Amino acid sequence: SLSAAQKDNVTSSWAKASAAWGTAGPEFFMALFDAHDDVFAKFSGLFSGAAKGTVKNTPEMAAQAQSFKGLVSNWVDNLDNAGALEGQCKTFAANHKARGISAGQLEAAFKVLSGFMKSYGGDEGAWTAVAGALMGEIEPNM
Ligand code: HEM
Numbered sequence: 001s002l003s004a005a006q007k008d009n010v011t012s013s014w015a016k017a018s019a020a021w022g023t024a025g026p027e028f029f030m031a032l033f034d035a036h037d038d039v040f041a042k043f044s045g046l047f048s049g050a051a052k053g054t055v056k057n058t059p060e061m062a063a064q065a066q067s068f069k070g071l072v073s074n075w076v077d078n079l080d081n082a083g084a085l086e087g088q089c090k091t092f093a094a095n096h097k098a099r100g101i102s103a104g105q106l107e108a109a110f111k112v113l114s115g116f117m118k119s120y121g122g123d124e125g126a127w128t129a130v131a132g133a134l135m136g137e138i139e140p141n142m
């Protein structure tokens with residue numbers, strides 16, 4: 001279950017982080033990489049083997065941030081549309097699975113995102129529920 005209140009909170013807070021994504025996106029990745037080394041490992045190719053505390057201001061980081069943001073924005077705009085959600089989720093999972101990434105790792109990411117969102121007026125509880133509904137749709141395909 002997702003209440004109307006949780007959905008409104010997720011949409012408003014995302015709007016705010018979205019306007020600041022130019023600088024916050026990279027901060028989000030750094031926290032993620034700091035919390036899970038296994039996650040950073042999967043980006044070795046994109047980063048060309050560079051060490052973790054060295055990727056923040058790279059052109060690849062900027063690009064990766066914009067990619068992350070475009071999918072999250074689509075999920076957010078369709079919270080009352082399970083059908084739409086399902087389809088976006090299918091592609092996302094097929095793509096990530098093919099890289100050897102686990103359901104557990106995806107889950108890890110959503111947790112760091114929920115905490116991160118607190119800085120933008122986000123209710124951690126509302127982000128956590130949104131993450132569970134999406135995981136319910138991703139898992140069967142992982
Ligand atoms: C859970 C929230 C996530 C979102 C919204 C997200 C979103 C995306 C999107 C939109 C793309 C580009 C389309 C594609 O190539 O699939 C992508 C690519 C990628 N993702 Fe994610 N992803 C997430 C989680 C992860 C995690 C946890 C990892 C690592 C364990 C990961 C690793 C990658 C890599 C390696 C690529 C390809 C980068 C390249 O172009 O070389 N993603 N992700």
Ligand SMILES: [C-]#N
Pocket residue numbers: 064067068
């Ligand atoms: C990773 N997006």
